[model samples]
Target chain A: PGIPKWRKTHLTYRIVNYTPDLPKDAVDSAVEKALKVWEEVTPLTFSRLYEGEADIMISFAVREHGDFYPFDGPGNVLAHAYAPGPGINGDAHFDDDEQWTKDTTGTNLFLVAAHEIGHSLGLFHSANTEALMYPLYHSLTDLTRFRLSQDDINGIQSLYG
Target chain B: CTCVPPHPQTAFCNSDLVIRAKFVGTPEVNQTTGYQRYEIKMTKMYKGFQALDIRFVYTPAMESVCGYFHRSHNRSEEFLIAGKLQDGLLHITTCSFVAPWNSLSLAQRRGFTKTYTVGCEECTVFPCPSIPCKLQSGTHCLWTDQCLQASEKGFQSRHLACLPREPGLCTWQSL
Candidate 1:
């Protein structure tokens, strides 16, 4: 298996709460969609943990939290996630304060989630906006409508395999 | 005043003020090859709006990208890039993405010496009212040569250079 030594191996999560912009099912599906897409890329597997020591805790937070990096209000910066560590490091955070949408809307969760996962997978933003890992918020939601720029793939594969 | 030039770049311009922070030791960059540092000046204006104002000589990829994407914002609020290497440590200033770059030293790029300024700005970027928040405020200070070399990199930060900033008169505070 190409599992990273630092990675939690077993991925898990909790929604913490729900956003008013989208229904609970809608939010869950977007997140699930985000995770599912990544699942197809590598041999890695993820399991949702209702409540426990989740390898990856996916939720939404706003402004200053316990983390050293605080959210920058609404626009300019959409959302961000941490890298694989306790692999607590693997967790993903979404900005609920933003409006949610499935496609071509204000801030695509799927797009950002993938980018955040890139961080979770030990990847950073790419200079190429065409790549999914660019540190910008695109309004599109078609996952396959993307490609991993060399820097992004290189960054992820470095930690994955 | 270089009372304690907060940083090397600061003291370089005007030795008015100086800052002492355990003198963050000189970084240790690998002495493998001859790392070159070049300087360029633009007296000629290109396409009017922009002059060949800056020479992005030894900049890191992240700084280069961030600098270009958001070059329109002012220097004080905008996160431009500036870093130096000494004793195997690369001390970056205004990393924008990270904090106190000088304190921890980007351990990864440690000892990598590169001093370059990317992006463009003018005097109006750092209004006293918006001093603490230029990151969100944007770095669109307009592009020019004098601002980059003379004022931007002048003794201490160009934060106060943009005087008559707003409803009040702007003055540099000697820390």
Candidate 2:
């Protein structure tokens, strides 16, 4: 089915809390880098909100978060995000049970966040395994060479362009 | 971000209720609790006897929470919804095995109706990225269709189900 997309170009986001697994600066940088993954391709611009509700509200939670789809411990479901729309839509939540890290040793926050941000911007899972929007997660050893597959770029561009 | 869904066979087995239904009318929104309730007409029930008389299904109103939202308002579209029972209500989320009925492959439809359940206790479906993929156990069946183009039914998703063929052995079988 056609999931909804954000109507405006400039969106704002806020991290409700910090995960103790990573230092505050690490989480902040990871989140910022994740947002940059989408902002680089689409016309969308994201501004961090210190207060008030942002278009995309991010948080790190353990099992039984505020929402219905709670985190499933350390593995299985690592994180989930809403499709684009009002209230709670576009927000992304990470599972704190996982070792949120800056690199591959544990679950890479940047990689996972990038995928979640894709959903936040209203993209569904792609059949192409190489696509960032793919449902399953595989470790990418080289963060320096990380890039969105053509499938991902095509999907986001189709929605925003 | 990394919330991986189970295999269709696994999903079907894990779910408390599974049905083929059509969205019948406008959804009712609960502003305070943040859920949207949709009226549905059941065409088929694959699992769960308690869901036989169910008329309404609830989902989060917000997509970030994995709420189910129909793209088209047209009632002509049908869906294969599999969910769990919560607070005496059938709650579905994007994480649940919810797919467009038309988007399912013929084999998938047949498997859902007949074969999938029979092998649920006997086998497991594991995705195989390459042809040389190996099975970890006798009950593990390799799924290699993910790389193929999706049809109206879908690619690997709608095309096949892993079922037991012989005692203690499972393989990919077309629906």
Candidate 3:
């Protein structure tokens, strides 16, 4: 939420792995749009890197996947993403324990991924529950109509503008 | 280390230090690590460390990293943070109890101070058997002294104590 905002406006990301909850392409598309959530707000632009080290990397893993913080399984924690920077800093890790779905029935991939991307772009959790950056996860009645709250816009703009 | 399910008090006591503080400004995250740093003006100490009115705590820079970061329209925010010192910086995780200071009952806040400053050697497990009681918040039944309202209360004879729902909100159960 504080220091990791990417120093650059243009960034590259790669999906290191995919979640079987949905097809691989679905993961790709969701990741694409999640980045758009911020790209729409700031001068930031994202490019997907198929290989090599990237500024941001996305993956799905079960408990204790290779980081200091481990997934707590089915509930409590849905997923966690890092703030902007190099190395593992901007990675987005989704929990495979939760049933990841395209729609609202299970955890919605777009909304959570959007939230995680907010973190990867250097935004922190918002106390304003109405904002997308809020720490807790909630389902969206209209995913296609999703838009960033003024709080989300202001945060990214402050960092990138 | 395998993550053991942590009891509320277990984290409360496990914390190397705890304090009631207000953020000096928007916290600063590391340039590389997403760890965030907070410059807090301490009003009181709970567990670990002694005295002083201000300190710094390093927390997960990513909001998704878990408990301890809050941001909103409020120009300044106060919090009750339970955490441990790592590499000399106080670090709080989702497992730690970090809540708004105003949300806590006077008694609950004081309990953290007494139990921490005094240590938990003789402390009770909390939610001590008392008359069935409920708070105005409908959060929990009062378990501390005389089952009194959270605002007007004092610590009981026991050492370890129960935790609150959020900050001022106490955790209670049928006894």
Candidate 4:
């Protein structure tokens, strides 16, 4: 069988908390931009929710935060997300142990969040290194010109389209 | 960034418990702890305690936390589960070597059953991205399976197992 994907075209998300590494506003902006990366390509639409359960729950947590997979101190795994489903399936979690930054100096929150969101939307790791969904993270510059690789777009469109 | 999924040999050597099981019945969720417990019936025991009978496995209820959620309701599908024994119980996560038994190559299935354990103490499988890849030592076997087609389960992963040749050296041999 094929990888599971969301049945609905519209979805809601909620940021459970913010990380100390960046300002609250910066975290919020990075998340919005990250979601927009998928939004611009697919027919899906995402709305932000202040209260109640959301389709995608976003949060930054340290080691052992109500899950089986705990974060290490730094390096290795930056973040993870779930496939589309009920309850915690579509949630995204960032490792607060790493120094998350808005740019290339430290681990870029935007790039990592964008990659995690791809997993949340049902895309698996791609063999193509240029694809955003590739397993390893690389430093990316020039946010204004950033775009999803053809491999990434093709994978998502195959599921959602 | 997420770490690349390790080679099967590495996963087999690292896991405390490895088995082939069928997911039977619905999962029971622990409300307070947010853990989902699935009742699994074992079909084969490759690595694990022989004295204890394992009937259940645990995972985080949330997928964001690396929980393994089986979407199919069919109980007939078997899984190759590799996990750690924590507090006398088996626990699985996304990082665990969990995959459908049918999805694996014939060599992978055989490796899990016997070949993998044969060399666990003698050799190690290391990723080799491209040709001309140099081996750091005699104990390391270059894993170039990634260079093959994604669907093709390359020669190394499908038919070869790294085993000790003499007292200190190891090389890839057909299983």
Please give me the DockQ of candidate 2 compared with the native complex: 0.31
Q: CA lDDT of B142 in candidate 2?
A: 62
Candidate numbers sorted by DockQ from highest down = 2, 4, 3, 1
lDDT digits (tens) for residues A4-88 of candidate 4: 7999989999999899999989999999999998999999899999999999999988887776567644543578888889987
Q: What is the TM-score of chain A in candidate 4?
A: 0.96
What lDDT score is found at residue B80 in candidate 4?
Answer: 87
User: Each candidate: what lDDT?
Assistant: 0.41, 0.77, 0.64, 0.79
Q: Is candidate 3 or candidate 4 better by DockQ?
A: 4
Which sections of candidate 3 miss by over 4 Å? Answer: B1-64, B67-92, B95-175
Alpha-carbon interface RMSD for all candidates, in angstroms: 14.8, 5.9, 11.4, 7.1
* DockQ for candidate 1, C-alpha atoms: 0.01
- Candidate achieving the largest lDDT: 4
Off by over 4 Å in 4: A1-68, A71-78, A81-113, A117-161, B1-3, B128-136, B147-152
**Model 2, A49-161: lDDT tens per residue?**
98899999989989889876666565446788888878888888888887777876567888889989999898877768788887555553468788779999999999998
Q: By DockQ thresholds, what CAPRI class is model 1?
A: incorrect
- The CAPRI classification for model 4 reads as incorrect
Q: Write candidate 1's Cα lDDT for B14-129 as tens digits.
A: 11111111111222223343122223222221112212133322222221112112222222221223333233322322222221223323321221121110111211232111
| Total clashing pairs in model 2 | 9
lDDT of model number 3: 0.64
